[PDB]
Amino acid sequence: SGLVPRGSHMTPDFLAIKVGGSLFSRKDEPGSLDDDAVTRFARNFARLAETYRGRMVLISGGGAFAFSLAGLTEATFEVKKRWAEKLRGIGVDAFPLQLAAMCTLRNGIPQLRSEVLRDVLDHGALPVLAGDALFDEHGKLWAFSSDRVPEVLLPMVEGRLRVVTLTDVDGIVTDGDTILPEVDARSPEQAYAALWGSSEGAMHTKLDALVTCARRGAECFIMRGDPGSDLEFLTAPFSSWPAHVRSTRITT
Amino acid sequence: SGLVPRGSHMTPDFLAIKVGGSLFSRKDEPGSLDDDAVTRFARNFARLAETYRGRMVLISGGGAFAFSLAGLTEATFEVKKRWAEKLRGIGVDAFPLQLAAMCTLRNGIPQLRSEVLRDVLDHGALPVLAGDALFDEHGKLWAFSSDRVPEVLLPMVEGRLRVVTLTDVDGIVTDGDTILPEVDARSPEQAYAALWGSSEGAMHTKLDALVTCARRGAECFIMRGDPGSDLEFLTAPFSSWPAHVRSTRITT
Known part of the structure; x- marks a missing residue:
């Protein structure tokens, strides 16, 4: 792999947005x-x-649910269908893809096993993905969170990947309370300490997934979603974002 | 590929059953x-x-529906879910798989592009499949009938594949009316002539798909389905089937 220019003044080449x-x-x-x-x-x-x-x-998040975990694949298919139907209703070529038919686990690591996802992207369509029940190498099903789905894109995306996880908080809160603006994925121990201090494991799952992505070059964010909010700034270099935006940014 | 023993006295190594x-x-x-x-x-x-x-x-058949064909993938997912839920309810490890996430068309031929189907089988589970909207090499969606899904299994199944299509007739009717018991896939022109004579294109789709499978060694059947009917004879050599069974058998 050659040298990839990176930094807060660069435009992303790919967006993985999780709602x-x-x-x-x-x-x-x-x-x-x-x-x-x-x-x-x-x-x-x-x-x-x-x-x-x-x-x-x-x-898409949501769609929560020996082999009973199989019902999870059906539950999260429904949520992908709901988004894809809505998006097609407004002119987007949105196509839901069952991650369980495309990806399995090996040694705990998700492995993309179907070429279809890359082809759909190359055709200019919008894949709609979600968490799922994935088989491992022993045939056992595991619940794979929607929050970890960006990990599956890491070997397939060329150039600068931006991952944005929209949630009901502005980022990771730390001690009054304030948002932690930056986390270095090479040594994120203080972010994990903030979670212990400000909780009561979905935020921990987010942090683990986005640290994993950032260690492979991605620029990752945890921020607040709001249905009506304009998201056009997510196309732009981080240094160009509006001043009102709050987030926790995770990079290496 | 080596010599595969075949004939009406041999037991199938694999069953693709379409309802x-x-x-x-x-x-x-x-x-x-x-x-x-x-x-x-x-x-x-x-x-x-x-x-x-x-x-x-x-x-499963059923689940009928620029990019509007995408809704077909959602429709046929629902029908796979209905069968898989029912089968899990009675102890079968049934897992629905979206064919569109696993298979694309190239020069009109379906290409299996995901390793997951073979893995699920190797784990001992029951894939539940259906027709779907498939992308071609140009990014165009096509409706791919449930009746053609056995074609996708041809390069992946080793040994003797039996394909059984359960329908609302006992086979292909020919001129009074009688069922055509055998069709040679190497030169099936008389079966197509029977369809023209006894019609008014779903039976033609069945015939084309099963001829395609039979030319690649499969033993194929069109026969009448009935919800309560015992199907154990489908595990057995064709020469051992009960006398009451009627079908059109397609082989080469």
């Missing part, structure tokens, strides 16, 4: 989605998809 | 499935899956 289930559903209303939230988020993701044509995936 | 949508749904009641039919068929397929552990796929 947390908490932003468009409620745990105490299982299976129901907030259609107004989905609709408004979809308009903002559609704009991103126009610019990042063939250079973006949308990952 | 027609007409057998468990109604065109005039779109999206609804007949749960009693699904339940009774599932009990019979579960028995087959016990014997053909890792050596069978179930293909």
Whole structure:
């Protein structure tokens, strides 16, 4: 692999945007989605998809569920269908892809085993992905969080990958409370210490996944999602972002 | 490829069983499935899956639907989910797999592009498949009938593949009317002549797919499905089948 120019003044070559289930559903209303939230988020993701044509995936959270874990693949398929239907309704070539048919685990590491994802991107379409039940090398099913799906893109994406995880907080909170603006993935021990101090394991899962991505060059963010908020700044160099934006940025 | 012993006295090494949508749904009641039919068929397929552990796929018909064809992948996912849920309910390790995430078209020929299907079989599970919208090499979506799904298995299955398409007739009818018992895939022109004479293109699609499979060694059947009917004879050599069974058998 050759030298990849990187930095806060560079434009991303690929966007993996993950939308947390908490932003468009409620745990105490299982299976129901907030259609107004989905609709408004979809308009903002559609704009991103126009610019990042063939250079973006949308990952949906939500769709929570010996072999009973198989029902998870069906649950998270439904959530991908809901986003893809909405996005096609507004002119985006959105196509849901079952991660379980494309990816398996080996030694705990997700392995992309289907060429289809790269082809769909090359055709200019928008894959809609989600967490899933994945088989390992012994045939055992494991729940693979939506928050870890960006990891599967690492060997396949060329150039500068930006990963954005939209959640119900502005980033990782630390001791009053304040957001930790930057985390160095090479040695992120202080971010993990902040989580212990400000909790009560979904944020820990996010941190582990985004550290993994950042160690492989990605520019990663945990930030607050809001259905109606404009996301066009996610196409731009980090140094050009509006002043109001708050996030935890994870890089190496 | 070495010499494969074949003939009506040999046991199949693999079963691809396709259940027609007409057998468990109604065109005039779109999206609804007949749960009693699904339940009774599932009990019979579960028995087959016990014997053909890792050596069978179930293909569901039904789930009918620029990029609007994408909705087909969602529709046929639902039908796979319905069968897989039912089969897991009776102890079968049934896992639905989106063919569109595993297979694309090149020069009109389906190409298996994901290793997951073979792995799932090797783990001893039952893949549940269906027709789908598949991308071609130019990024165009095509409707790929459930009736053609056995074609995708041809390069992957070793040994003797038996393909059984369950439909609402006993086979191909010819001129009174009688069932054509045998078709030679090397030169099946009389079967196509029978279809022209006894019609008014789903049976033609079946015939084309099963001729394609038979020319690659498969032993193929068009026969009548019935939810409650015992299917154990499908594990046995054709020469051992009960006398009451009627079918059109397609081989080369």
